[PDB]
Design a protein around this ligand. Structure first.
Ligand SMILES: Nc1ncnc2c1ncn2[C@@H]1O[C@H](CSCC[C@H](N)C(=O)O)[C@@H](O)[C@H]1O
Ligand SMILES: Nc1ncnc2c1ncn2[C@@H]1O[C@H](CSCC[C@H](N)C(=O)O)[C@@H](O)[C@H]1O
Lengths: 257, 268
């Protein structure tokens, strides 16, 4: 995990959220696919509550665009200070914030409620109460006296576990860990890379545990979830860019029983 | 009597028209704020979107009558017409359109409207694609004077007669009186083929507006006057709706009391 110390947010954002992976115009892309999964899931209106925690936010907010309308208290987290600062910069509309507006626009497009994207960002920025540091390896990943309401009504995590875990069993424990933050009967929306083993974030070179839909399902089960949905996106050639070796992307809607 | 003088007056007044001012007054907030569904902007795009969505307004060629320096009136229309003709009386307006066509950064930013059309049309489309199509189908920007019996001049370029017409806030804005208005309608109707469709937007009961230094003279009209005029010109009125201008939104840029949207089909 010392590799994460060379991790550059601006390089990561650039690699994954700027064209081509960042062009949202093509519906068959990975960005539109991620957003649709979240939109659809929340649109069921079975995922709901007062509080929600985003595990391993990094420098990104997209994972919460659809979510923000169903939970009034939203908590974001990451391991690195540089990311929290990068989040802050966008939350407070500071100088040099990253432009998520294409993503805001698309979420509004997908949820199809005629909402304008400034209302969407406005609601998100507002509903996010705190940005916290976090380590999923710790059995209490948020420490002892966290400003975060526990247990949360729901959890969201994208591209975290498989990226901070050396192997399957490690990945499994990380899940066990964060699962403890989730109220019984609550919800988890997990996104991650499939059969990925490395990706770059500037000068840093992160090791990833290559997982599969089957491994991922089984791990959610082991952690005590009822899997409600598990969808797979296969990474198209034109989005294989030399920033990683991701083969596909998985999305899971799991419920703590 | 005599039309010439009033028209001359109108023409004279427009020589002070400031596009950037018009744009600031009408298509930047609070009117340009597309976030409130109850605002005039959304209402307009929604009238256009819903109408094209019926699929009853189609063809090869569209002509926008008195485009000014705005494109929003064509956002939902472009996905339905191969060939679009934009027009205006003033060159400074046409230059303004030209700047946006050329995607120069100097140009006005219509992306909020682009996005909103995409939003309400419900096809998942992205605004850059919406805009790229619009820029692609606008085949020309022509001089136009609605008071002339041939508003485009004889032997004009435009493919005539067109399958459809769009016009927004033009006729009433350049007509001194109701008869002038009615005549202007008759004139542009000659550009429209029988069985074709006219989509008309304009201000209700308005007498003036601002375009910078230029404070302009509008013939105030009513829904009925508009309905009657269309019928007079040989249309069947398919839809005619009214937006009442809210307290805020009345900003001193005009004395408009509301807005009309007319969908009319040229009997033939
Ligand atoms: N031990 C740890 N516990 C929790 N998060 C960690 C961690 N070590 C690294 N991370 C964070 O995990 C993130 C994975 S990148 C994921 C970014 C974002 N969620 C997205 O969807 O794009 C990195 O930002 C990294 O800072
Ligand atoms: N005689 C005439 N014939 C046609 N257009 C005229 C005209 N005299 C003035 N105009 C144009 O009528 C326009 C009215 S403002 C309308 C602008 C635009 N259609 C919109 O929706 O906002 C001005 O751009 C002006 O140049």
């Amino acid at each position: 995990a010392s590799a994460y110390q060379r991790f550059e947010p601006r390089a990561y954002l650039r690699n994954n959220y700027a064209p081509p992976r960042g062009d949202l115009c093509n519906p068959n892309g990975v960005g539109p696919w991620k957003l649709r999964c979240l939109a659809q899931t929340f649109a069921t209106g079975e995922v709901s509550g007062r509080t929600l925690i985003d595990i391993g936010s990094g420098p990104t907010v997209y994972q919460l665009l659809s979510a923000c309308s169903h939970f009034e208290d939203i908590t974001m987290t990451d391991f690195l200070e540089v990311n929290r600062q990068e989040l802050g910069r966008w939350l407070q509309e500071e100088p040099g914030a990253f432009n998520w507006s294409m993503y805001s626009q698309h979420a509004c497009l997908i949820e199809g409620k005629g909402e304008c994207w400034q209302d969407k960002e406005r609601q998100l920025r507002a509903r996010v109460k705190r940005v916290l540091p976090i380590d999923v390896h710790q059995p209490q990943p948020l420490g002892a006296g966290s400003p975060a309401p526990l247990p949360a009504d729901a959890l969201v995590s994208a591209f975290c576990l498989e990226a901070v875990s050396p192997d399957l069993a490690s990945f499994q424990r990380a899940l066990d860990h964060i699962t403890t933050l989730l109220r019984p009967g609550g919800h988890l929306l997990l996104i991650g890379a499939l059969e990925e083993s490395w990706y770059l974030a500037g000068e840093a070179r992160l090791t990833v545990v290559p997982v599969s839909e089957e491994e991922v399902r089984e791990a959610l089960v082991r952690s005590g979830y009822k899997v409600r949905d598990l969808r797979t996106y296969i990474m198209p050639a034109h989005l294989q860019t030399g920033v990683d070796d991701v083969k596909g992307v998985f999305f899971a809607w799991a419920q703590k029983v």
